[PDB]
Each structure stands twice: as C-alpha cells, then as structure tokens.
Specification:
The PDB classes it as oxidoreductase/inhibitor. With 188 residues, this protein is of the alpha+beta class. It has eight helices and five strands, in the order ββααβαααααββα. It has a five-stranded mixed beta sheet, with helices on both faces. Helix 3 packs across helix 7. Bound molecules: [6-(3-methoxyphenyl)-1-benzofuran-3-yl]acetic acid.
C-alpha cells in the first residue's frame, strides 16, 4: 500500500486507551525538536491538514538534560497553565540550544519575565498543585509508550509517526509527507 506500517508510521503493540487525538512529545534539548519548531513548523502544518477543532496536545519530556530537563517540563506545565506556550517556545529553544544562556531554573524564569509574564504570576503557577498535576500528566502520557526518543507524534493512542521513513531531501516535501500521514492516520 502507499501508507505502510513500518514506513511512514508504526503501530503500538499496546494501544493507549483514551489518549488525545494528536499527541506530540518534545524536549527543549532535542535538536530535531528545535527544527520542528523553528524551520519546519510541523505542528502548524499538521493542524492545517486536519479538520477544524481537532484536539492537538504537546508535552515536554524529562529524559534529556538531567535536572534542567525536569525543570523545563515543569516550566512547560507553567506555560500550559498560563496559556503562554506561543510566547515562550522560541526563547526557550534558543536559550537552551542557540545562545546556551539557560543553565538554571532562574534562567528559565527570566525567559517568562522577558516575555511579559509577571514574576508573581510565574512563581504562583510554578508552585501550584494545578502545575504539579500538569507535570504528572506529561509524565503519564510519555510513560504510556516508554518514549525514549523525541520528536514523537502519536495518533489516537495507536499510531506513531515514523519520520525515519519519509523523504528528507526537501524541507517542505518532508513536512507535507509528515502532515499527510497524520491526516491518513486520523482517518483510519
Ligand atoms: C529535510 O529538512 C529537514 C530540516 C531539519 C530537520 C529535518 C529532520 C530530518 C529527519 C528527522 C527525524 C527522523 C530521523 O532521525 O531520521 C526526526 O526529525 C527529523 C528532522 C529535516
């Protein structure tokens, strides 16, 4: 067939009940994740190919970067609790990977401050039980599929995107194939 298990996608041996429809995992330490955000715009291109209103969910992972990796998962919980993901994704990716000026949880807080989040607001969220449970939720979602690599996308708890099996000579073709696969998996 044109779309084949083991080419553009794989199938989880243990399908995940109740997962979000489109679920992405990333790390601010992950180089391909930087490209998915800054130059490929994978999430937006996937969104444009799915029906209006489909839930897309994006979570951070702990396994890259030791202490700071967990700090970044907690900061991503803060960003989701406050609804400021679009304000902080780029400066967090560039602080970690471009300028390497994020070395501590305080440097992470500086990114939010500079993006216009008030210090009081950030600190209250950071210490909140709502954010603790958002951290638990990110961990649970990743643990459900023993994730040991990012960037990762899962469709309906059942299918995992396989960019290894797509064409990467052309950035936009690659993005197309990826988003068209997500569309095919969602219609499955
Ligand atoms: C073609 O233009 C670009 C630009 C930036 C990153 C990538 C890229 C390639 C492969 C991958 C994989 C799978 C693997 O490791 O082969 C995951 O993310 C990727 C990003 C392509």
């Amino acid at each position: 067939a044109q779309y084949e298990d083991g080419k553009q996608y794989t199938t989880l041996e243990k399908p995940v009940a109740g997962a979000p429809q489109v679920l992405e995992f990333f790390s601010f330490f992950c180089p391909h994740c930087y490209q998915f955000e800054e130059v490929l715009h994978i999430s937006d291109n996937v969104k444009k190919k799915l029906p209006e209103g489909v839930k897309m969910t994006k979570y951070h992972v702990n396994f890259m970067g030791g202490d700071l990796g967990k700090d970044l998962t907690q900061a991503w919980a803060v960003a989701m609790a406050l609804g400021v993901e679009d304000k902080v994704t780029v400066p967090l990716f560039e602080g970690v990977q471009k300028t390497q000026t994020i070395r501590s949880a305080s440097d992470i807080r500086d990114v939010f401050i500079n993006a216009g989040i008030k210090g009081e607001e950030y600190d209250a969220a950071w210490n909140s039980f709502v954010v603790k449970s958002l951290v638990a939720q990110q961990e649970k979602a990743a643990a459900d599929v023993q994730l040991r690599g990012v960037p990762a996308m899962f469709v309906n708890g059942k299918y995992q995107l396989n960019p290894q099996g797509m064409d990467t000579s052309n950035m936009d073709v690659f993005v197309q194939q990826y988003a068209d696969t997500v569309k095919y998996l969602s219609e499955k």
